[PDB]
Amino acid sequence: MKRTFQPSVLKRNRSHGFRARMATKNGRQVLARRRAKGRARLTVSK
């Protein structure tokens, strides 16, 4: 049966990628929070 996660790298990158995050100040708030917590992986990019 068809489950919820249907992977696509292009769509993943366009929705949650580093450049998509940097495009808005709220995405930049996301990056700042994740940097402050100390996350080894800021985005889905890598």
Partner RNA sequence: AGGACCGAACCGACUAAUGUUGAAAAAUUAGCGGAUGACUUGUGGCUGGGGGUGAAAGGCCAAUCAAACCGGGAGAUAGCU
Partner RNA sequence: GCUCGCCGGAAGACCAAGGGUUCCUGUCCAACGUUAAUCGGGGCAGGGUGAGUCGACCCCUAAGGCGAGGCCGAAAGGCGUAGUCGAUGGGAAACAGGUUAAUAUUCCUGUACUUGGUGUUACUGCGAAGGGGGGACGGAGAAGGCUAUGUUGGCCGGGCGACGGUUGUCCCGGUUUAAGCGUGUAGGCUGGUUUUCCAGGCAAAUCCGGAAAAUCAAGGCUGAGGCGUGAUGACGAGGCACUACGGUGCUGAAGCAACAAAUGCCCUGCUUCCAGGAAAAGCCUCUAAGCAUCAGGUAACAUCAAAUCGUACCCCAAACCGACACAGGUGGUCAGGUAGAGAAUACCAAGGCGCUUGAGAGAACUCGGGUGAAGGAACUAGGCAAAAUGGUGCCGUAACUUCGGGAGAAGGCACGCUGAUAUGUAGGUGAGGUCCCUCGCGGAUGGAGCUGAAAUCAGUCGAAGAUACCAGCUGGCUGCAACUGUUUAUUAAAAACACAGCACUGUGCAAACACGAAAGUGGACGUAUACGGUGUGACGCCUGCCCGGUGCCGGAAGGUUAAUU
* Residues engaged in binding RNA (CB under 7 A): 1-11, 14-15, 23, 25
Report the alpha-carbon distance of residue 41 to residue 39 in Å, rounded. Answer: 5
CB of 40 to RNA, least distance (A): 17
Give, as one character, the DSSP assignment of residue 23: T
Q: Which residue has the tokens 């992986």?
A: 41
CB of 45 to RNA, least distance (A): 13
Report the alpha-carbon distance of residue 3 to residue 22 in Å, rounded. Answer: 30
CB of 33 to RNA, least distance (A): 9
